[PDB]
Amino acid sequence: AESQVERFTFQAEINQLMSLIINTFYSNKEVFLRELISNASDALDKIRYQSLTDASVLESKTELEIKIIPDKTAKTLTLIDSGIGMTKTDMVKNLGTIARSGTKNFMEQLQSGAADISMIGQFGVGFYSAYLVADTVIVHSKNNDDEQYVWESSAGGEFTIALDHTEPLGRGTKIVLHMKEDQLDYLDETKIKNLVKKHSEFIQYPISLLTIK
Ligand SMILES: Nc1ncnc2c1ncn2[C@@H]1O[C@H](COP(=O)(O)OP(=O)(O)CP(=O)(O)O)[C@@H](O)[C@H]1O
Ligand SMILES: [Mg+2]
């Protein structure tokens, strides 16, 4: 097999944020689940609204749903949506190379005490909450306008993007969190089942919890 892999450097402030998220103790890291579900919901909304003005956008995948997959053997939590998806350029621009002023301000407020980790989503950097519980994050995504791509980072100032040769999504995003050893309790069946219930009260799309044994 062969793949071309492109390597990118994180914007300096995003690199600093990732370092802060990883190298500091946080008591309650539950916000990561809220943020991942929120992104899935937003993506489903986007394709849903696009369909109202152009019905054909749904032809790649008719269902609009979220699947959450804890896998203890693999030490992974996977969240799949059939939302809008991201092109390669979408992933480069949205997941590391561009920072908004929310990043600097969040780090300031974390240090001053004005903000805690649970408010990360108010600063426009909700995605990076994944690194509270994960050593490596892998983002597989398929947008109607591009081939399926896979973004991966274990922080440390770099991410990679490659044409995806794993299972076709049709359309949407599959995010795979490789869980830190001390955060593996997030993969416990009843714990994740109940947290999903807790962080999906206002979600208007079906959620399926698929526990891998
Ligand atoms: N499942 C998904 N499908 C499509 N795009 C996604 C996605 N998850 C993340 N993204 C993209 O990455 C960007 C960054 O996500 P992130 O959650 O950090 O910020 P956000 O724009 O959702 C505001 P917030 O900080 O409130 O969550 C999003 O704006 C979106 O474009
Ligand atoms: Mg978000």
Side-chain angles (χ1 to χ4, degrees), residues 55-90:
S56 70
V57 307
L58 291 176
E59 293 181 13
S60 44
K61 193 161 189 60
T62 51
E63 309 93 343
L64 297 183
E65 60 178 329
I66 302 164
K67 296 175 179 178
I68 301 171
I69 310 99
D71 189 335
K72 275 186 186 172
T73 313
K75 297 184 185 180
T76 62
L77 182 64
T78 297
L79 293 95
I80 304 169
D81 69 71
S82 54
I84 186 74
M86 287 170 283
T87 67
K88 178 184 176 161
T89 298
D90 288 345

XYZ file of all heavy atoms in Angstrom, residues 55-90:
268
model
N -31.916 19.700 -2.246
C -32.213 18.353 -1.742
C -31.134 17.308 -2.048
O -30.973 16.343 -1.293
C -33.571 17.881 -2.249
N -30.405 17.514 -3.147
C -29.428 16.545 -3.651
C -28.224 16.325 -2.728
O -27.536 15.305 -2.833
C -28.951 16.946 -5.053
O -28.139 18.109 -5.012
N -27.972 17.267 -1.821
C -26.809 17.162 -0.927
C -26.852 15.909 -0.031
O -25.808 15.446 0.444
C -26.585 18.443 -0.081
C -26.533 19.681 -0.984
C -27.664 18.595 0.989
N -28.053 15.362 0.173
C -28.254 14.200 1.046
C -28.015 12.851 0.368
O -27.999 11.817 1.037
C -29.662 14.213 1.661
C -30.015 15.282 2.702
C -31.484 15.161 3.103
C -29.111 15.195 3.935
N -27.828 12.861 -0.949
C -27.737 11.617 -1.726
C -26.545 10.724 -1.339
O -26.595 9.504 -1.520
C -27.766 11.919 -3.232
C -29.123 12.485 -3.704
C -29.195 12.764 -5.203
O -28.309 12.303 -5.956
O -30.156 13.444 -5.632
N -25.493 11.342 -0.796
C -24.297 10.634 -0.315
C -24.544 9.777 0.931
O -23.829 8.794 1.167
C -23.174 11.635 -0.028
O -23.673 12.771 0.670
N -25.537 10.171 1.729
C -25.929 9.458 2.949
C -27.250 10.030 3.455
O -27.311 11.186 3.878
C -24.846 9.576 4.032
C -25.026 8.619 5.204
C -23.718 8.474 5.962
C -23.770 7.363 7.009
N -24.058 6.026 6.421
N -28.302 9.218 3.409
C -29.660 9.688 3.708
C -29.951 9.899 5.205
O -30.691 10.816 5.578
C -30.729 8.750 3.091
O -30.448 7.397 3.455
C -30.719 8.857 1.578
N -29.368 9.059 6.054
C -29.581 9.158 7.499
C -28.835 10.351 8.108
O -27.734 10.707 7.669
C -29.173 7.860 8.204
C -29.778 6.579 7.602
C -28.886 5.919 6.554
O -27.956 6.575 6.031
O -29.122 4.729 6.247
N -29.456 10.975 9.106
C -28.832 12.051 9.873
C -28.799 11.633 11.337
O -29.787 11.773 12.058
C -29.587 13.377 9.703
C -29.648 13.976 8.292
C -30.362 15.314 8.313
C -28.248 14.130 7.709
N -27.655 11.110 11.763
C -27.564 10.475 13.069
C -26.154 10.579 13.635
O -25.202 10.930 12.926
C -27.974 9.004 12.959
C -27.108 8.190 11.997
C -27.494 6.718 11.917
O -27.983 6.155 12.924
O -27.285 6.119 10.840
N -26.045 10.272 14.923
C -24.776 10.191 15.628
C -24.624 8.790 16.209
O -25.592 8.203 16.712
C -24.711 11.212 16.785
C -24.923 12.635 16.257
C -23.396 11.084 17.584
C -25.248 13.650 17.347
N -23.408 8.257 16.127
C -23.076 6.980 16.742
C -21.890 7.210 17.659
O -20.947 7.906 17.278
C -22.721 5.929 15.685
C -23.866 5.564 14.742
C -23.409 4.608 13.657
C -24.564 4.230 12.733
N -24.097 3.319 11.644
N -21.963 6.659 18.869
C -20.871 6.761 19.844
C -20.423 5.363 20.238
O -21.243 4.535 20.650
C -21.272 7.597 21.078
C -21.679 9.010 20.634
C -20.128 7.660 22.093
C -22.293 9.875 21.715
N -19.120 5.112 20.108
C -18.577 3.756 20.153
C -17.413 3.658 21.147
O -16.268 3.935 20.800
C -18.147 3.242 18.730
C -19.255 3.457 17.693
C -17.778 1.758 18.758
C -19.068 4.675 16.854
N -17.712 3.278 22.404
C -16.591 2.995 23.304
C -16.018 1.605 23.029
O -16.769 0.644 22.856
C -17.229 3.043 24.693
C -18.687 2.729 24.455
C -19.017 3.266 23.097
N -14.697 1.500 23.020
C -14.036 0.252 22.682
C -12.862 0.084 23.629
O -11.764 0.573 23.381
C -13.581 0.286 21.207
C -13.078 -1.057 20.695
O -12.620 -1.904 21.493
O -13.119 -1.244 19.454
N -13.116 -0.622 24.728
C -12.089 -0.845 25.750
C -10.838 -1.568 25.259
O -9.715 -1.185 25.617
C -12.683 -1.582 26.942
C -13.333 -0.667 27.918
C -13.777 -1.439 29.133
C -14.559 -0.561 30.066
N -15.142 -1.388 31.161
N -11.024 -2.598 24.436
C -9.901 -3.369 23.907
C -8.963 -2.467 23.111
O -7.740 -2.527 23.279
C -10.375 -4.549 23.041
O -11.423 -5.241 23.733
C -9.225 -5.518 22.774
N -9.554 -1.618 22.276
C -8.813 -0.662 21.460
C -8.354 0.569 22.243
O -7.504 1.324 21.755
C -9.663 -0.228 20.278
N -8.915 0.766 23.439
C -8.721 1.986 24.249
C -9.127 3.255 23.483
O -8.429 4.277 23.503
C -7.291 2.093 24.802
C -6.937 0.960 25.751
C -5.554 1.124 26.360
C -5.219 -0.099 27.211
N -3.870 -0.009 27.831
N -10.254 3.166 22.783
C -10.723 4.283 21.981
C -12.187 4.607 22.237
O -12.994 3.734 22.590
C -10.529 4.058 20.445
O -11.288 2.925 20.007
C -9.060 3.892 20.078
N -12.512 5.881 22.052
C -13.891 6.333 21.961
C -14.066 6.950 20.582
O -13.324 7.844 20.206
C -14.205 7.374 23.038
C -15.642 7.916 23.104
C -16.637 6.807 23.451
C -15.758 9.033 24.132
N -15.056 6.472 19.841
C -15.276 6.960 18.485
C -16.632 7.646 18.430
O -17.604 7.143 18.996
C -15.192 5.810 17.463
O -13.872 5.253 17.494
C -15.486 6.292 16.030
N -16.673 8.811 17.784
C -17.939 9.512 17.557
C -18.129 9.753 16.068
O -17.300 10.395 15.416
C -17.990 10.831 18.323
C -18.020 10.756 19.853
C -16.617 10.886 20.419
C -18.932 11.843 20.402
N -19.217 9.219 15.525
C -19.476 9.324 14.097
C -20.743 10.126 13.876
O -21.757 9.869 14.526
C -19.635 7.938 13.421
C -18.402 7.066 13.669
C -19.877 8.096 11.907
C -18.589 5.623 13.276
N -20.674 11.098 12.968
C -21.869 11.808 12.532
C -22.021 11.682 11.018
O -21.040 11.491 10.299
C -21.842 13.278 12.984
C -20.789 14.111 12.260
O -20.960 14.403 11.056
O -19.800 14.502 12.913
N -23.255 11.786 10.536
C -23.481 11.860 9.099
C -23.748 13.312 8.676
O -24.600 13.593 7.831
C -24.621 10.930 8.708
O -25.761 11.216 9.491
N -22.994 14.235 9.263
C -23.175 15.653 8.988
C -22.490 16.089 7.711
O -22.212 15.273 6.833
N -22.210 17.386 7.629
C -21.635 18.005 6.434
C -20.299 17.391 5.989
O -20.023 17.292 4.786
C -21.488 19.564 6.628
C -21.017 20.253 5.334
C -20.604 19.914 7.825
C -22.089 20.352 4.297
N -19.467 17.002 6.954
C -18.111 16.558 6.651
C -17.172 17.726 6.359
O -17.598 18.875 6.187
N -15.888 17.422 6.293
C -14.875 18.427 5.986
C -14.036 17.976 4.788
O -13.625 16.812 4.726
C -13.955 18.633 7.194
C -14.573 19.402 8.369
S -13.544 19.367 9.858
C -13.911 17.694 10.411
N -13.787 18.894 3.845
C -12.793 18.679 2.786
C -11.399 18.710 3.419
O -11.262 19.058 4.590
C -12.837 19.785 1.704
O -12.404 21.028 2.271
C -14.250 19.974 1.150
N -10.372 18.368 2.641
C -8.986 18.465 3.115
C -8.677 19.889 3.584
O -8.155 20.098 4.684
C -7.993 18.051 2.019
C -6.545 18.188 2.472
C -5.519 17.869 1.389
C -4.132 18.150 1.956
N -3.026 17.480 1.210
N -9.003 20.863 2.738
C -8.790 22.270 3.065
C -9.552 22.690 4.331
O -8.998 23.399 5.173
C -9.130 23.173 1.862
O -8.238 22.841 0.786
C -8.961 24.664 2.223
N -10.799 22.228 4.466
C -11.576 22.438 5.699
C -10.813 21.975 6.948
O -10.760 22.698 7.935
C -12.941 21.735 5.642
C -13.918 22.395 4.694
O -13.694 23.551 4.267
O -14.943 21.742 4.375
